[PDB]
Every structure is written in structure tokens, then in C-alpha cells.
Amino acid sequence: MTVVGAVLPELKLYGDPTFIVSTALATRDFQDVHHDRDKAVAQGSKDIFVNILTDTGLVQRYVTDWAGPSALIKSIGLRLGVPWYAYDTVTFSGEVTAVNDGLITVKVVGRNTLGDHVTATVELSMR
Amino acid sequence: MTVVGAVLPELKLYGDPTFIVSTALATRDFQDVHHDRDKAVAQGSKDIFVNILTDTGLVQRYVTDWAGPSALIKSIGLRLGVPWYAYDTVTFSGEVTAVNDGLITVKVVGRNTLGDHVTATVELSM
Amino acid sequence: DIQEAVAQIKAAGPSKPRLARDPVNQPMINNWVEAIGDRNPIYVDDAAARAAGHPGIVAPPAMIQVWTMMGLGGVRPKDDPLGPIIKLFDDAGYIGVVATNCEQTYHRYLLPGEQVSISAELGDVVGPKQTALGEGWFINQHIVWQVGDEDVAEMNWRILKFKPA
Amino acid sequence: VSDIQEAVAQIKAAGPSKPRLARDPVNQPMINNWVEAIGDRNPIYVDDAAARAAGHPGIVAPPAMIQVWTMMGLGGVRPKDDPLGPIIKLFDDAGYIGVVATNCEQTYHRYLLPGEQVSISAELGDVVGPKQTALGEGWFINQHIVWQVGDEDVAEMNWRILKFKPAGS
Ligand SMILES: [Ca+2]
Ligand SMILES: [Cl-]
Ligand SMILES: [Cl-]
């Protein structure tokens, strides 16, 4: 029964600098703030931080880890809250919020110790 | 044929963190010392520093910048020296040291604030 | 001054379609799934992708924006709508930047070898607002990606340009 | 010193590692990433017409990218027949926990084309020591690396490292 309320397994990710830098560059985002601490600090940011293309990719991964290889992602909408700085750990949680004829909606929240880093809504079809 | 003693134009390169990180990852070298300051410092280094594969590429670039697109690089030998840390500038200099039947040998040195960062011997045809 | 620049950019219309530097390709998929840590086999194994109903390996949908990034060597086209706005804020001291919202829709999955193009339009620029990082302006943008003349994805996203406190 | 020489001999007796295929064939997207970061504007790496004017069959890879193709990547693990693993363990166990690369000599037999699939094989060469060095007492370890496309040798490398005892050892 694809169930409204279904809970996705937790995913905890440690944002060490290798993670932040490698994801930013693999998304072809060379903005200094994701790999140059001095440039992040120059804009008042605490340290380097994860970029939004990586947030989108991680939300996708989190949902398909649960949904499986046959899942077809239709849309991802997200809003950022607090930054994901080097050495923060983000814990992803998720819940199915809608099921309508093969089409499922999942709410995802990634939280770090301070607060909600990312809040996302994902629409997908599952087989 | 070029001749022994011919000098190459200088090339100065600023090692900003973007340069160091982007080159290391473009060489598929994920060693923490090239992109994680805390890990470089943790191991007793001053800051992040340029990796060896980037040295090889820069030495290649330096020589082909001078010799042109038709140059064929036959070998690059490096003797590794002092580190090239973030915010230091390396100046490359070069001199032709040998010409043997179409094969040119060039000695290249990259120097920074700490001394000789890399000494290279490049063989090419031109 | 800001809103005049915004009007002038909007009036120029959507940017002329620009081809991604590379077609969709396995080496870049490999780099991305490696860093993101996404072990979904359909991005790296043809047989897995076929068991999931695809013709062969497909690209992760969330890589759409990756294909058309400028990277280090890319030179922005003269009709780029976002570049001039970024420059205006930078020159005025709003040198801080953070992306704040992203909504992407994926019409279908892309295959290695397909060539993506991008067209972008400048949306509303809203401010000045007092944020946790300082005073700033939110910049909205709508992007469409095509393969040939087929729309394959769309994005609305929002970035904050701010003066650091 | 005696047990070290004996251990090195047993490692060498296994011969070179079996050829290990690069993750990807030589490819334009990775050439692009590399020339952009290195800042090398040589047109033969990005323009077929320019490459042909220089006598190549089409765009060629930068020779200095040879080692890039076969890098293990994030979290990569060397194969069970790589002689470097056992050598590093041997010297770590003997207290030489420090390491630095000292020399790298690469020879390029020809230029590679996008689509070509490279493999790598590694052989242990000279192991010399103990030596007094400016970094401490250490042993130098040489390796001969060969890259192939199919059965054709296309490049090779002599790689030298120093395993040394750090100041507080
Ligand atoms: Ca800026
Ligand atoms: Cl971002
Ligand atoms: Cl290195």
C-alpha cells in the first residue's frame, strides 16, 4: 500500500571539508565560498558551506535510497534555512505526505545541530 | 632548431586557494592536504599546497606555451622541492640545456618565497 | 537604479539558448555520484537502468544544472541576465551571496550523449531586506533546459546578494 | 635491515600488479576540467582542426594527464596485488611512518585519443637504506609504473618516495 505517513530511514552525513569541496566541484560550482574558508569568512560566513546543487542532489539520493532504482523523480523543491558548515552533521528525515495514483509526495528535512538546513518537497512515481 | 642556452619567457602564477583546490581535483587527487586547511595543518604543514600532478601539468604548459601547439612532449622529470602553499606565487624559469637530433631538453625551475618548489627536465620535439 | 537595470534586463528577453560545454556524459556522472555518495545503480550500470525501465544508464535528474555551469573556463554570453545584476550588487558592496531556494521539474531522464541547452530569464529582484547575514536583495530566476527543441527540465531559483555585517 | 631486505624480496617476487583499468576512457569532459584548472590554452586539447594541424588524428589528451586517468578516486582502495601496500606496511611497522615523494619521471610514448582505455601496472624497483636524510633516517622506495592501451605501452613512470622516521620517533 504506498502509505501517507510512511517514514524514510534516517540518513546522517558528516560535512567534512572533503565532502563540501568535492560535492561543490562535482556540481561544477567553483564559487569560492564552498572551498575557500578565507572567502567564506570575508562575507561573514563561519566557514565553507555546502552549495545548493549538492543539497538538491542529496535530497534526491535520500529519497531514492528509500524508493529504490525504479523510482522516477518528477520534481524537487527546496528551501534553505541555516548553513551547512564544515564539521556540521546533517540528519535527513522524511515522510510520505501524499499518494495519488502512482505519484507520491515526500517531505524531507535536513537538520544540523543549530537548526533546519534544508526543507524539501519531492514528487516521484514508484513502481 | 633552438639552441643550448635559449631562455623561456617567465611565467608567474598566484596560488590562490581556488587554483590549488581546482587543480588538485581536476587531477583526481582527493588527498586532504590539497583542499582541507585543517588537515594540512594537522599534519604539520603551513596550509593547503599544490599537488604533484599539477606540477607536472604546469611544467608541461610552461614548455608548450613557448614551443607551441606542434610541440611533442616526450618526457617530464620532476625533482620535488619546497611546498607551494596557498597565497604564494611560483615563478617559472627555463633554459634549453641540450639539443640532440631534433630532441630538445629544457630545464625548468619553479621558485617561490620558500625556495625552489620544483626542478624539472623536459624532453620534447619542436 | 536597481529596478531600472532589472527592467532593462527583462526587456532583453530570455537568453539565447546556450549549449552545455559537454553532452551528458559518464565521466561527469561518475564524479557526481562519487562525491554525493548516491549508489543508485541506474546511473552507473546499464543492466540496472534497464531493470528500472530505462534504455540504458541515465543521468541523475538533479545533475541538470551541472551540465550548463560555466565552471572555470566558461565565458558568460553577453545576453546573460544574471551576470549584470550580480555585478551591480558587487560594485555596490553587496558582495555576499547565498542561494536560498531551488525548485526543479524534470520532464524526463537524460541519456549519456544527449546535448543540453539552457535559456534563462531574470525574475523579480526584491529588497532591500534585513536578513541574518545583513541587508540584501533577493534575485529570482527562471531557467529552461532543452535537448534540441524539447523542454527537458525547468528551474525557479532564488539567490540573496547581501552586504556582510 | 636484514628482515627488511628479505621482505622486499618476497614482495618483488610477485612481479608487477595485473593491469588495472582506468575508471573512464580518455575523455573530453575530464580533459576540459584539467586544461581549465591548469590554465593551459593549447588548442590541440580542445580543437580537432588545431590538433590535426599539429599532426594528430584529432583532439589529443595532454600527456601530463596520464596518471589522472588511473587515479583511484574518493575512498579508493588499491588492488590486492599492488606492491606499494605491503611496502608501506613494512616501513610503518619499522617506525618509518613519515612519507614524502622526492622524484617523478614520466615518459610518454605517444599522445592518447578520447575513447582510448588506459590500464596501469606497478612494479617495485630499488629499495635503498637506511639513509640519513634532512627529514630523518629513512629508506627510498622506487616504483616503475607502466600504462597500456590494450597490449601497447603508451607511457611509463619512475616514482620515488622516502619513508622516514619523524623528529619524535
Ligand atoms: Ca561576487
Ligand atoms: Cl550555491
Ligand atoms: Cl601529491
C-alpha D119 chain-centroid distance = 11
- Cell numbers given for D86: 605491503
State the chains in contact with A (3 or more Cβ–Cβ pairs under 8 Å).
B, C
Q: How many A from CA of A42 to the centre of ligand 1?
A: 12
Q: DSSP code of C15?
A: P
Residue B112 belongs to what H/E stretch?
A: strand B103-112
Residues of B with CB under 8 A from a CB of A: 16-18, 21-22, 25, 30, 32, 35-39
Q: What CA–CA distance (Å, rounded) separates C29 from C35?
A: 10
**Which residues on A lie below 8 Å from C39 (Cβ)?**
65
Burial (CB count within 10 angstroms: exposed 0-12, middle 13-18, buried 19+), residue C41: middle
- Tell if the CB–CB gap between C72 and D36 is shorter than 8 Å: yes
**Which chains contact D through at least 3 pairs of Cβ atoms less than 8 Å apart?**
B, C
Domain spans of chain C? 1-165
Interface of A with C (CB under 8 A): 13, 19, 22-23, 25-31, 33, 42-45, 51-61, 64-65, 69-70, 72-80, 83, 127
HEC string of C110-149 equals: CCCCCCEEEEEEEEEEEEEEEECCEEEEEEEEEEEEEECC
B45: amino acid identity, one letter:
S
User: Position of cell 522524511?
Assistant: A94
B115 Rama class: left (phi>0) / alpha (psi -120 to 50) / beta? left
Q: B79: which residues sit within 8 A by CB, 6+ positions away?
A: B118, B119, B120, D102, D103
State the CB neighbour count (10 A cutoff) for residue C78: 10
Map residue D30 onto helix, strand or coil. Answer: helix
- Distance, CA C121 to ligand 3 centroid (Å)? 43
* Inter-residue contact D81 to D18 (CB < 8 Å): yes
Domains of chain B and any CATH numbers = 1-126 (3.10.129.10)
Other beta carbons within 10 Å of D130: 15
The span from the CA of C44 to the CA of C56, in Å, is 9
Q: What is the DSSP string of B48-111?
A: -B--HHHHHHHHHHHHHHHH-TT-EEEEEEEEE-S--BTT-EEEEEEEEEEEETTEEEEEEEEE
Q: How many angstroms separate the Cα of C23 from the Cα of each of A29, A80, C20, C115, C148?
A: 18, 30, 7, 4, 12
Do C38 and A57 lie within an 8 Å CB cutoff?
A: yes
Which superfamily, per CATH, for C1-165?
Hotdog Thioesterase (3.10.129.10)
Structural contact between residues C96 and C89, judged by C-beta atoms closer than 8 angstroms: no
Q: Within an 8 Å CB–CB cutoff, is residue C32 touching chain D?
A: no
Cβ count near D132 (within 10 Å): 9
By the CB criterion, residues less than 5 angstroms from ion ligand 2 are A 51-52; C 99
Our CA-based measurement puts residue C9 at a distance from the nearest CA of chain D, in whole angstroms, of: 30
Determine the Cα–Cα distance for residues D120 and D156; give it in Å rounded to an integer: 9
Under a CB-based contact definition with an 8 Å cutoff, are residues D39 and D137 in contact?
A: no
For residue B30, the CA-to-ligand 3 centroid distance in Å is 9
Distances, alpha carbon B66 to alpha carbons A1, B100, C19, in Å: 69, 19, 32
**Partner-chain contact C102 A55, CB within 8 Å:** yes
Taking the CA atoms of B111, B114, B115 and B116 in sequence, report the sign of the dihedral they define: negative
Residue A34 DSSP one-character state: G
Residue D85 CA: distances (Å) to CA of D1, D99, D141: 19, 13, 12
As a residue count, chain D comes to: 169
As separate numbers, helices (DSSP H) first and strands (DSSP E) second, chain A gives 3, 5
Q: Cβ A76–C69 below 8 Å, yes or no?
A: no
Residue C156 CB-density burial (10 A; 0-12 exposed, 13-18 middle, 19+ buried): middle
Provide the angle, in degrees to the nearest 10, between the axes of the packed helices B17-26 and A17-26.
70
CB pairs under 8 A between A and C: 119
Question: Would you say B68 and B80 are in contact if contact means Cβ atoms under 8 Å apart?
Answer: no
* Pairs of CB atoms within 8 A across A/B: 37
**Fold exhibited by the domain D1-169:** Thiol Ester Dehydrase; Chain A (3.10.129)
Which of D102, D130, D118, D105 lies closest to D154, judged by CA?
D118
Amino acid of residue D161: I
Cβ–Cβ below 8 Å for A32 and B18:
yes
Cα-based angle B4, B7, B10 (whole degrees, multiple of 5)? 160
Backbone angles phi, psi at A75, to 5 degrees: -165, 150
The residues, any chain, with a CB within 8 Å of residue A31's CB and separated by 6 or more, are A24, A51, C97
Counting every residue written for chain A, the total comes to 127
